[PDB]
């Protein structure tokens, strides 16, 4: 039904969190419909590989399922890892911090339409 | 003490989720006091029957009993709409997606929990 | 696809290890078929383990079994016979059952090893037969 | 940087649950900075070892890293089990009431000061 | 250190263990250095099973392959995947002895060699 | 019946694997009868591997277990000791440890293969001596 773009950030991946982070995708009924390991380097930031990262390896993944943008930012939990994360969420369970928030999530059917074209160009 | 009767819904069986769900209502510090891997035709005001929370399809009932089971099992399982209603952590936001397929089912109150149980677990 | 008998045995129960073990089953790939929690009559207990009689172990099998309920399920698909054994483990949890098996990650003790698995194709007819006769 | 300390009550030792709790911490971000099985013996209570627990076998814990004191508050998730934990937090998903609910951590930097004190001298 | 080359079979991507596999690998203590899910081609197929001269199930579906990459990586990575047969062969704790039932749907593949390693990695990864 | 001595190496706390290591001997069935996070003295290391002493590696023994803190336990329980070497697995982690076991599922070389624990009865009963005097 819907696509949604998700990008482990960096400290994720420093942390061994990808198969953790894609589990929780997957038994919450979403499919992985295009999955890649990507380096991206430095050098506002809207639109481009850096809009939602900082530089380093980053996983990006089109999920996709029923509800699957809004379902995502669930799994996520909100920005704040500590003050606004749920328990039970990526964030409220492996994070501390916003900085290293681990994970992002397509907030739009409009971001993910632009987002998924750019880092999974002709999906 | 305090009883429950709970129904793990076609599409839970369907996703292999029997012991997942079981696992988080034993964790939680429940018993499973009954438990029965049942079928359901489909019956052509659906209160007090068999199809009343299910559609048709396999269905595992169990009796769930321990301090607050009621609101104990609510709370695991999370609110209806998967995604809407239901927190992170709970059965429906952790697992489901949409409302029609939210896995698993709880009695609400005591006096459904009785008769929920009486259907699905007559002499219990 | 094969169909085998998987008992969870009072200890198990006690243990409130009951989705654990139905977690293993499925993720493994096997469904269930049935599934009961029930209390073990002394009947039924003298069936099941009927080829135990004369044997010094005879009776406290038939106290054990009988000193709670059980849950007893059909557990089906691909080698479901030898995949449940598998799973369950050697007999010994220390001495025989491997890491990774239900008995190896959870148990210490025979008498208290958890579960039981048809060990054969013809067991497995008898106990479901036994066990679920309606299957 | 803050550290706060944690207890896992009588009833959490029973329940086998010491594993489940600390592995809570760590992959939430946070390091065990200290770790002692402790008995405590029955003797309002207050700056005592029975301030938070009854009398019986309690872990104590030095918790430490970003957020320390309201990261462990929001694992472990509010006093009433069922009525005010959080699904996904300590005593949302492994407890039933208040009486039982497995574990503590300090509420206030002060607190985090004065048990940390207490159960770990000289630390 | 040894880089070794994992192919998660569409038999794993079906059943949703991309993640489950993925966090074996990680808490083993080894590295994901590539990764990618893409469809196999017959000219890619025939490549990898080059070595079965005497149509095929790897084309079905999407794989995901990865670059695992640290300490003993391969004979790691063929520990954490198990034997061919998940029930008769591959023990207990392993990938297919804990999700498989059949050599034919035994989800994941490792390199069994360090040449076996160079050869699959210059096939699947050209450039890493 | 049995209690043996646990040791989560320096490598084990550095990788914060002290809960699922605490877990996996829980969920056995073993109880902790002693738990305590320290930093291990010269003289403490020494004493613990006494028995490799003359020997060329004994000096990395030595810079290794006091290079950070470890944790050191108690475990009591049916068979305690021959569990707790089922749960750790092998000394290599990839070429002898199990899969299932604690080095076969998170650790790759010897020398960085996370836990420890008792051999024997004599080891548990001289280890648990040395590191918990009290006990």
Redesign the interface.
């Known amino acids: 039904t819907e696509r949604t773009l998700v990008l482990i950030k960096p400290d994720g991946?420093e942390?061994?969190?990808?198969?953790?982070?894609?589990?929780?995708?997957?038994?919450?009924?979403?499919?992985?419909?295009?999955?890649?390991?990507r380096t991206v380097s430095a050098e506002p930031f809207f639109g481009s590989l850096l809009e939602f990262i900082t530089s380093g390896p980053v996983?990006a993944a089109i999920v996709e399922?029923?509800?699957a943008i809004?379902?995502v930012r669930?799994?996520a939990?909100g920005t704040d890892?500590?003050?606004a994360a749920?328990?039970?969420?990526i964030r409220?369970?492996?994070?501390?911090?916003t900085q290293f928030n681990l994970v992002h999530g397509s907030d739009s059917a409009e971001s993910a339409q632009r987002e998924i074209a750019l880092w999974f160009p002709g999906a």
Request: glycine share 14%; hydrophobic share 50%.
């Open positions: 991946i942390r061994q969190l990808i198969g953790e982070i894609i589990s929780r995708i997957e038994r919450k009924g979403l499919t992985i419909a295009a999955l890649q390991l996983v399922g029923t509800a809004a379902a669930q799994l939990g890892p500590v003050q749920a328990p039970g969420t409220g369970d492996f994070a501390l911090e």
